[PDB]
Amino acid sequence: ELSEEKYIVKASSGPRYIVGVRNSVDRSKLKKGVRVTLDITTLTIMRILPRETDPLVYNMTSFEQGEITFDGIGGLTEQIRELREVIELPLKNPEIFQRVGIKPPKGVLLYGPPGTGKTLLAKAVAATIGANFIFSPASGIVDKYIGESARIIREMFAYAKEHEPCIIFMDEVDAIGGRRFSEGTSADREIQRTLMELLTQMDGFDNLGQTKIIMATN
Amino acid sequence: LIETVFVKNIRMLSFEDISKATHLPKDNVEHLVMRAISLGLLKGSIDQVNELVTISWVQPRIISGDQITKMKDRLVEWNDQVEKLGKKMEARGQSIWV
Amino acid sequence: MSLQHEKVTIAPLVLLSALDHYERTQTKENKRCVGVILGDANSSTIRVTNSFALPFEEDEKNSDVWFLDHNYIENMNEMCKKINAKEKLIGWYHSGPKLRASDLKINELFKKYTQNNPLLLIVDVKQQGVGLPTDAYVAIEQVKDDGTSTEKTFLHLPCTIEAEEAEEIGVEHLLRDVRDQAAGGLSIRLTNQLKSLKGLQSKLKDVVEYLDKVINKELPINHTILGKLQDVFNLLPNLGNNLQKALTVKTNDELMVIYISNLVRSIIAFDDLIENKIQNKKIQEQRVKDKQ
Amino acid sequence: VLEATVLVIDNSEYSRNGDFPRTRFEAQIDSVEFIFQAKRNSNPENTVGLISGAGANPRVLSTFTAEFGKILAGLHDTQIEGKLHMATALQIAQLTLKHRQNKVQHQRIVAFVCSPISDSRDELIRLAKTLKKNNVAVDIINFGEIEQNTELLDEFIAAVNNPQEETSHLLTVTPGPRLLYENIASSPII
Amino acid sequence: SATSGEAAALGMGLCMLGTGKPEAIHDMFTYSQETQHGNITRGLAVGLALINYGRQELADDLITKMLASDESLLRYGGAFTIALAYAGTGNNSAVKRLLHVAVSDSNDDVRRAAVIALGFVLLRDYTTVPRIVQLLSKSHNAHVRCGTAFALGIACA
Amino acid sequence: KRIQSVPLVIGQFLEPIDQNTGIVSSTTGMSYVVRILSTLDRELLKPSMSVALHRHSNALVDILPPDSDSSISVMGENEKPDVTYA
Amino acid sequence: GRDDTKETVYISSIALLKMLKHGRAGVPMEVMGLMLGEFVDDYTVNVVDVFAMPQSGTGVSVEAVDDVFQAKMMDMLKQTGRDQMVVGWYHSHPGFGCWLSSVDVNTQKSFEQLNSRAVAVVVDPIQSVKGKVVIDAFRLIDTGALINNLEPRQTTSNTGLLNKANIQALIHGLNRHYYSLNIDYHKTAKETKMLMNLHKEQWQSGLKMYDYEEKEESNLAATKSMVKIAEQYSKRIEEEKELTEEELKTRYVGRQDPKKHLSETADETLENNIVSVLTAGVNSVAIK
Ligand SMILES: Nc1ncnc2c1ncn2[C@@H]1O[C@H](COP(=O)(O)OP(=O)(O)OP(=O)(O)O)[C@@H](O)[C@H]1O
Numbered sequence A: 001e002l003s004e005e006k007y008i009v010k011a012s013s014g015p016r017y018i019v020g021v022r023n024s025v026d027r028s029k030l031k032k033g034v035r036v037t038l039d040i041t042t043l044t045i046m047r048i049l050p051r052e053t054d055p056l057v058y059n060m061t062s063f064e065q066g067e068i069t070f071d072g073i074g075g076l077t078e079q080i081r082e083l084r085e086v087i088e089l090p091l092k093n094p095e096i097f098q099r100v101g102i103k104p105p106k107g108v109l110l111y112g113p114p115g116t117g118k119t120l121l122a123k124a125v126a127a128t129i130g131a132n133f134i135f136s137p138a139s140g141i142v143d144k145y146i147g148e149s150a151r152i153i154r155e156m157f158a159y160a161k162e163h164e165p166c167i168i169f170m171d172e173v174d175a176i177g178g179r180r181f182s183e184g185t186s187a188d189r190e191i192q193r194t195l196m197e198l199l200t201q202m203d204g205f206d207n208l209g210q211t212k213i214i215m216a217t218n
Numbered sequence B: 001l002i003e004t005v006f007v008k009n010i011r012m013l014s015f016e017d018i019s020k021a022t023h024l025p026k027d028n029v030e031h032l033v034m035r036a037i038s039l040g041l042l043k044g045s046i047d048q049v050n051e052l053v054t055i056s057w058v059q060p061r062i063i064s065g066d067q068i069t070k071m072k073d074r075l076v077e078w079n080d081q082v083e084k085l086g087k088k089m090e091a092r093g094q095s096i097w098v
Numbered sequence C: 001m002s003l004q005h006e007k008v009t010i011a012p013l014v015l016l017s018a019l020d021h022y023e024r025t026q027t028k029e030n031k032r033c034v035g036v037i038l039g040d041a042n043s044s045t046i047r048v049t050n051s052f053a054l055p056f057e058e059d060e061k062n063s064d065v066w067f068l069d070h071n072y073i074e075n076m077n078e079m080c081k082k083i084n085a086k087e088k089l090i091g092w093y094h095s096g097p098k099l100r101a102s103d104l105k106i107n108e109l110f111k112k113y114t115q116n117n118p119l120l121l122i123v124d125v126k127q128q129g130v131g132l133p134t135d136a137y138v139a140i141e142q143v144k145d146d147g148t149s150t151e152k153t154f155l156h157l158p159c160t161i162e163a164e165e166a167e168e169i170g171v172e173h174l175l176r177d178v179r180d181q182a183a184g185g186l187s188i189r190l191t192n193q194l195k196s197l198k199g200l201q202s203k204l205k206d207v208v209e210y211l212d213k214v215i216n217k218e219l220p221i222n223h224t225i226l227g228k229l230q231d232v233f234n235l236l237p238n239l240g241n242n243l244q245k246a247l248t249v250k251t252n253d254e255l256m257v258i259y260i261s262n263l264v265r266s267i268i269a270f271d272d273l274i275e276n277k278i279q280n281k282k283i284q285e286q287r288v289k290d291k292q
Numbered sequence D: 001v002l003e004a005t006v007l008v009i010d011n012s013e014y015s016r017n018g019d020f021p022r023t024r025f026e027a028q029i030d031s032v033e034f035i036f037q038a039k040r041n042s043n044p045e046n047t048v049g050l051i052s053g054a055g056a057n058p059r060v061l062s063t064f065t066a067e068f069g070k071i072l073a074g075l076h077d078t079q080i081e082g083k084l085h086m087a088t089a090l091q092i093a094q095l096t097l098k099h100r101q102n103k104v105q106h107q108r109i110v111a112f113v114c115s116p117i118s119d120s121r122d123e124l125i126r127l128a129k130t131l132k133k134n135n136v137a138v139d140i141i142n143f144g145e146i147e148q149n150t151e152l153l154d155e156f157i158a159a160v161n162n163p164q165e166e167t168s169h170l171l172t173v174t175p176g177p178r179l180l181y182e183n184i185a186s187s188p189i190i
Numbered sequence E: 001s002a003t004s005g006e007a008a009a010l011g012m013g014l015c016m017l018g019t020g021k022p023e024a025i026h027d028m029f030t031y032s033q034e035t036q037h038g039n040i041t042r043g044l045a046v047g048l049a050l051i052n053y054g055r056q057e058l059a060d061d062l063i064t065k066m067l068a069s070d071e072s073l074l075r076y077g078g079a080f081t082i083a084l085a086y087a088g089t090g091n092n093s094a095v096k097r098l099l100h101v102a103v104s105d106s107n108d109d110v111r112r113a114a115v116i117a118l119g120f121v122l123l124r125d126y127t128t129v130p131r132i133v134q135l136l137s138k139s140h141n142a143h144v145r146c147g148t149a150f151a152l153g154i155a156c157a
Numbered sequence F: 001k002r003i004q005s006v007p008l009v010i011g012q013f014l015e016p017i018d019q020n021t022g023i024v025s026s027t028t029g030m031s032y033v034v035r036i037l038s039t040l041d042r043e044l045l046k047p048s049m050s051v052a053l054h055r056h057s058n059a060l061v062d063i064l065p066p067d068s069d070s071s072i073s074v075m076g077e078n079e080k081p082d083v084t085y086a
Numbered sequence G: 001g002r003d004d005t006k007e008t009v010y011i012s013s014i015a016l017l018k019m020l021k022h023g024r025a026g027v028p029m030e031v032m033g034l035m036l037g038e039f040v041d042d043y044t045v046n047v048v049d050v051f052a053m054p055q056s057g058t059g060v061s062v063e064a065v066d067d068v069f070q071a072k073m074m075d076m077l078k079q080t081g082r083d084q085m086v087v088g089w090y091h092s093h094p095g096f097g098c099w100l101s102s103v104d105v106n107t108q109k110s111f112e113q114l115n116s117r118a119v120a121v122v123v124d125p126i127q128s129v130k131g132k133v134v135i136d137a138f139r140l141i142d143t144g145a146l147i148n149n150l151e152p153r154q155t156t157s158n159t160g161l162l163n164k165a166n167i168q169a170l171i172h173g174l175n176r177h178y179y180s181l182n183i184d185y186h187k188t189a190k191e192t193k194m195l196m197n198l199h200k201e202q203w204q205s206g207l208k209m210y211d212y213e214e215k216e217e218s219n220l221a222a223t224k225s226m227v228k229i230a231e232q233y234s235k236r237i238e239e240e241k242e243l244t245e246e247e248l249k250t251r252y253v254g255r256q257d258p259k260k261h262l263s264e265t266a267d268e269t270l271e272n273n274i275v276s277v278l279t280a281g282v283n284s285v286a287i288k
């Protein structure tokens, strides 16, 4: 906010601009981050559009539904308890987690032999319990263009902060989970940037507010 | 007290004058001025080591016809002083008044 | 009830529309011209921004024969709202030259159309004045100065002419022949000082004249005015003793600072002279050895 | 006929009385209704006005208009207070007639009086001759204090008495058990 | 009529040239301050300039009037009135006033007229003119440059 | 001061070549050699500045408070982490 | 008569101020309003004042030509004078520049089929600055006069040829569809005398000395800054001995030149100090 009538707005194209605002837009609701509309000719702020949801995030959270419930899962009853003590308990009883003093857990890395229920459990969690589920494939994040393999993760974690509680669930993470090479090629180097971006937005210079991450691999 | 302050004028006073003009003893004048200041009649300050009661702004009074002439003459003198100062200022710095 | 009468701000467009109105309807002498003062309010500083013409009529007779159209106010209101809904009626103005009898009476007609207390704006449209030709007069009810029934009368407010971005551009373009854009800072401040002194002298002469009138009883005796004058006299400081010494010591310090600053300016001029002489010598050498 | 008219209704304390049921105020409102309707039927181009002669100095309630909505809303918001300064009201009505939107409609005034005319007689005759000079036609419908008003009403009409122009018609109908607009329909109008 | 008005004013000025009739002066000056058409005002100004041809001291008035007038077209006529009153004389009152107008004025048209008038006044001292106008010929305002070009053209004809 | 309209492109000053020219890098991506406006405080043209550029000409026309172009912001109090040395 | 190039549109102060106020209030919508004036003659188009047409929900297109509003405003402006014609229309083009578009051309055609001499003045509140308000009227070319190639322009005077057509305006087509006109704001002595009041201070502010503590803190701070700047000046003079001109031409581009700061501080503090002394003395003498 350079002045009352001079703003520094970015553009989806990429260039920055020094843009004069209209007369009806409430100047109070103009801080770092708010999306605005720019007139194509004179580049003048018009509207105060709310936060954005990347289409590659709605395409993730808008999975069908899943008809299997916790009854359909058999044999797995102790591990169901262990998972539910992190998925359901913090989201519906954040008082025992206070007087006892435990820091609420964030990640639950389901793992086992291929074909025991590591994905069916996630489908049950999506159907049962609740909270805004975000199913995440491993390779469904990686894009050809530079940086977009990390911007997608950034929007994935930003959507959760505005939809608390969130149960973000990656899958087959051994695609972007590999032990970072020391002499890998160019392809394996851009992925490591994505692994850094994912890594920081769990314990970095910020606290994950109410986001739980479920993580499955073979 | 108020009428003597307004007649005798003088921003200062004395304990003896107030005692004579109010019939109170020279020891009760202090409490008299206490009441006067507290009630808002004056805004002065006492001094007992040397009895030199100091007076400031006094409660206003309705102005009679005679007082108008004195105030008018004082206005005339003030306006003449202002006009002379303005004339001197204009004459001295006419090179930069643009 | 809102107390919003502390400060009044007028954009030049309202006033110029007033002048255009007066020169348009061919108003001769004694014929006042009246319009509305559309603007924004509900804040401490009442701000006038736009105006329009009104079909005000009045014969120079009994003060109650004044006529003014009621439908015109609302009809202008609707169109102006269509153009801009941020400008609301905040009263009325008359084309000077001074307050008249019906000002209190007609103000009540605008009570319903206005939301707050209607604002009166006197406009010296024919320009007999020397200072600002605009002054505000909000009608308020206060006790009589003569110890009689409380009266609903006008109160003067400090009015300052100030323009916004839209109108400052036009004002600066229009008078871009007489304004001294060079001027100088200290010179313009000293000119302002002299103008303020002359204004003080004029107001003093007016007060003296009014007192001269009241001693001859052409006007009644107002005890509030006399009390204010006596307060003015009481507040007059006596200089010609402790205050005198404090003022003298401050003036001496201030002159010492002036001395230091002038010394700095002189040394800056010295460096400028040295550099300029060096460059002149270099130019002379250049021309001499390139000619030969 | 294109005829710009103003209706000087009276809301004085005497006009509050109820010799005509319900009240002289309500009867005056009904007469205003009838006059507006008749003028509309004669020609819709004619514009009518509403000026109240009471409530301190007279206050204009609406300018020359042909729509009943605004004036009728004004009729519901004019309290019965003050006296009838009919001289100032007539002067104001004359002032309004200068600003007809149609500058061809002839000037007409119909005034309702329900209180004594306690005005300067010479000034009243001067006003009447001024109205005649401007070709202004005035009609006065008297019901109420007929014993006094009729001393100055005939003088007004004999001072106006337009022979060839719009002739002024006086009505001093004594309070009777018939509808007021029926009484005013024939004699003053036609 | 704005099409015949300019020519009518110019012919009226030419017919009474040099005479300085005290009636045509008043008539044309009064009429110049009424006509809304722009062309007629300048035509009357030039006619007034032609009227005062030769009458050096007699045309001291109409110079205080027109060079202090409000309509920017009338000062354009004041410049030419100075040019034709003190024509071929080099009188210094006219030259000083012409310079003051040529530097201190808003309408550049009047600046050009004033510089052309300066060139007209010193026609009997053609040696000097390229010395006074040398400073004129380097001003930022282009109208002054055109004026001094015309002044040279008139002087050293 | 008319070129300072309010469509503008933020650039980054790189090197002052002359008194009235400079090498700016517009946000569009490519560097330019442009003429600096003769009203700016030329003492503020520090390298890697946040000067503004005219839309179609790229002539430098305004210098900005150098804490404005920043996409990264100084950590204030809403993001103040809540751990201690203890 | 094939018009002429010396035609000039005379805009009064009221018209220009209303134009700018209405243009700045609708950025970036291209608001439009009519233009009340009179046709003095073939060469002059007087303009008295303007009033605003409402901006319908169209956005950035000048197409709301509502007739009810125009008729009502014209008819009941007559009640208080302003008996004038519908000479032209003005619409603001904020940001782009002064030039007509196809929609503007169609609207001006509509106006020409009613008056045939209607100007199309185009304000531009965004790129206007205090002294160079950009304004220029337009009027459409005839039609098939391009067969004669004599677009209506008889250069019987140089007063029309002096103005130079804009560069980007020609891109949209200036001499191809609408020959440009001249613009001459005509003032009045009453208006220019008294618009001076915008920069006339209140009378009771000249003799007002400000609080006598800031006038000492400011002096002390200025003196300390002067000391530091003098030290920097000493080091500047020391460093200047061994520098070549190709650097000094660009040396003080990015760092504080410790000479203009010294002069600016000296002049500012001396002006403030002189004003303070004069105010103090003047009030001490005259007020008493
Ligand atoms: N406990 C269980 N009860 C019933 N069916 C089960 C159970 N565990 C797994 N399944 C079956 O597993 C299938 C779902 O895939 P599954 O859970 O075997 O994959 P996964 O091990 O998570 O895969 P990946 O190796 O890709 O990580 C379904 O057909 C479901 O019937």
Ligand SMILES: [Mg+2]
Residues within 6 Å of the ligand: A118, A119, A120
């Ligand atoms: Mg699986």
Ligand SMILES: [Zn+2]
Residues within 6 Å of the ligand: G030, G062, G091, G093, G100, G101, G103, G104
């Ligand atoms: Zn357009």
